[PDB]
Enzyme design. Structure first.
Site, PDB file in Angstrom:
ATOM      1  N   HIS A  42    -109.853  80.023  -1.252  1.00  0.00           N
ATOM      2  CA  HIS A  42    -110.643  81.253  -1.355  1.00  0.00           C
ATOM      3  C   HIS A  42    -109.811  82.443  -0.522  1.00  0.00           C
ATOM      4  O   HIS A  42    -109.909  83.668  -0.958  1.00  0.00           O
ATOM      5  CB  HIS A  42    -112.003  81.188  -0.840  1.00  0.00           C
ATOM      6  N   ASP A  88    -112.278  73.876  -2.012  1.00  0.00           N
ATOM      7  CA  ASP A  88    -111.876  75.022  -1.322  1.00  0.00           C
ATOM      8  C   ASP A  88    -110.558  74.489  -0.456  1.00  0.00           C
ATOM      9  O   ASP A  88    -110.586  74.419   0.931  1.00  0.00           O
ATOM     10  CB  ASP A  88    -112.989  75.836  -0.477  1.00  0.00           C
ATOM     11  N   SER A 185    -111.644  81.679   8.047  1.00  0.00           N
ATOM     12  CA  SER A 185    -111.345  81.017   6.980  1.00  0.00           C
ATOM     13  C   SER A 185    -110.051  80.408   6.790  1.00  0.00           C
ATOM     14  O   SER A 185    -109.239  81.224   7.054  1.00  0.00           O
ATOM     15  CB  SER A 185    -111.891  81.512   5.895  1.00  0.00           C
ATOM     16  N   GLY A 186    -109.991  79.291   6.285  1.00  0.00           N
ATOM     17  CA  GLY A 186    -108.616  78.623   6.004  1.00  0.00           C
ATOM     18  C   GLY A 186    -107.981  77.838   7.312  1.00  0.00           C
ATOM     19  O   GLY A 186    -107.012  77.133   7.002  1.00  0.00           O
TER      20      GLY A 186
END
Ligand code: IVK
Ligand code: CA
Ligand code: NA
Lengths: 233, 54
Positions: A42, A88, A185-186
Site C-alpha cells: 500500500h 500487504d 506503515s511499511g
C-alpha cells in the site's frame, strides 16, 4: 508511533524510511539484506517516486551515518488490493548495496513453523517508525519504538470494521493509548528471541491510531516467508 | 528432547526431526559445534542491535 519511546542508539538498525519527492518520510521499511527492503504494498500508492534512507535516527540532524539509496526493482505482491488491504507486502531491490554499520543492519527472517510456534506465541513484539505521535498529530523527527502485545485473532476480528484475513494479525492495546500510526506503515514489527530480533510483521493499517477498541493491523510475515525468499532470488 | 521446553536448548531455530531435536540458524550464522549455539559469521549479523562501536 503513539506512546512508546525514542529508539536508542543502535537499537533499531533495521529501520528504513521511504522518502517522497521532497525528502519527506511517508512510510517505513525493514532492512533484510544489503540489497533488499521489506515494506507494505500500500505504501507504493502513496508516492509516485521515492527513495530509501537508512541509518537515520533524527530527520532534522545530519549524524553522518545516514545514506539514501535508489530503488532498482519494486516487487509488489500480485494479490494486493486497496479494496481489502490483503497481501500487504512488497520487497524493494536497491540500485546500490547497503553498507552495514552503526544503526544499519538487517533483521532476521525466521523459519515459518518455528516462527508460528515460538515467535507469534510470545507476549509482545516491537514496532518502530517515524510516524505521527497521535492520530491527528505531526510525524516524529526522531525514530520511535513501541512494545505491542500480540492480540488474539478472534478478538481482532470482532474489534474490526473490516475483514481480518489470515494474512493479517492484530497487535497493540484495547484502550491504552499506544499504537503505530500514519507514517509508520511499511515498517518493522520484530520479535525478540534470546537477544536476536526476527521480522514478524509489516505495519499495515488501523482504524485511526490508538483508538479505544481498535488494534494495529499488521501483515503476517509468516504467511509470506517463501514469497519473500523468491522475491529476493 | 522437545522444542517446547527452552526451545530444545537451541539459540535460534528448533525442530523435532526424524523424531529428534535439531537446531539451526539464520543466514549469517553458523551452528556451533555443540549443535545448539548460533555463531555470527560477520560483524553485522541479522537481528543484532549495533551496540558497540567497531
Ligand atoms: O495508518 C493508520 N493507522 C495505523 C496503521 C497501522 C497500524 Cl499497525 C496501526 C494504526 C491510519 C491513520 N490514518 C488516519 C490519519 F491519517 F488521520 F492518521 C488512516 C490510516 C489507516 O490505516 N486507514 C485505514 C483504514 C482501513 C483500511 N482498510 C482495511 C481493510 C480493507 C479496506 C480498508 O480500507 C485501510 C486503511 F489504510
Ligand atoms: Ca539524521
Ligand atoms: Na486500541
Amino acid at each position: 508511533i503513539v506512546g512508546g519511546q525514542e529508539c536508542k542508539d543502535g537499537e533499531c538498525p533495521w529501520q528504513a524510511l521511504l522518502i517522497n519527492e521532497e525528502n519527506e518520510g511517508f512510510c517505513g521499511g525493514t532492512i533484510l539484506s544489503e540489497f533488499y527492503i521489506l515494506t507494505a504494498a500500500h505504501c507504493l500508492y502513496q508516492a509516485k517516486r521515492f527513495k530509501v534512507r537508512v541509518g537515520d535516527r533524527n530527520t532534522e540532524q545530519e549524524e553522518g551515518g545516514e545514506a539514501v539509496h535508489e530503488v532498482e526493482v519494486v516487487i509488489k505482491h500480485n494479490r494486493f488490493t486497496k479494496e481489502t488491504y490483503d497481501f500487504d507486502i512488497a520487497v524493494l531491490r536497491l540500485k546500490t548495496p547497503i553498507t552495514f554499520r552503526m544503526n544499519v543492519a538487517p533483521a532476521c527472517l525466521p523459519e515459518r513453523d518455528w516462527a508460528e510456534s515460538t515467535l507469534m506465541t510470545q507476549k509482545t513484539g516491537i514496532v518502530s517508525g517515524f510516524g505521527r505521535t497521535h492520530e491527528k498529530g505531526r510525524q516524529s523527527t526522531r525514530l520511535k519504538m513501541l512494545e505491542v502485545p500480540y492480540v488474539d485473532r478472534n478478538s481482532c476480528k470482532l474489534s474490526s470494521s473490516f475483514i481480518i484475513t489470515q494474512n493479517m494479525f492484530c497487535a497493540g492495546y484495547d484502550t491504552k493509548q499506544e499504537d503505530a500510526c500514519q507514517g509508520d506503515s511499511g515498517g518493522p514489527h520484530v520479535t525478540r528471541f534470546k537477544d536476536t530480533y526476527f521480522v514478524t510483521g509489516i505495519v499495515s493499517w488501523g482504524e485511526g491510531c490508538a483508538r479505544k477498541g481498535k488494534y494495529g493491523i499488521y501483515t503476517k510475515v509468516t504467511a509470506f516467508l517463501k514469497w519473500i525468499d523468491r522475491s529476493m532470488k | 528432547k522437545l522444542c517446547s521446553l527452552d526451545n530444545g536448548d537451541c539459540d535460534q531455530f528448533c525442530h523435532e526431526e526424524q523424531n529428534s531435536v535439531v537446531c539451526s540458524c539464520a543466514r549469517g550464522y553458523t551452528l556451533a559445534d555443540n549443535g545448539k549455539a548460533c555463531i555470527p559469521t560477520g560483524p553485522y549479523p541479522c537481528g543484532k542491535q549495533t551496540l558497540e562501536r567497531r
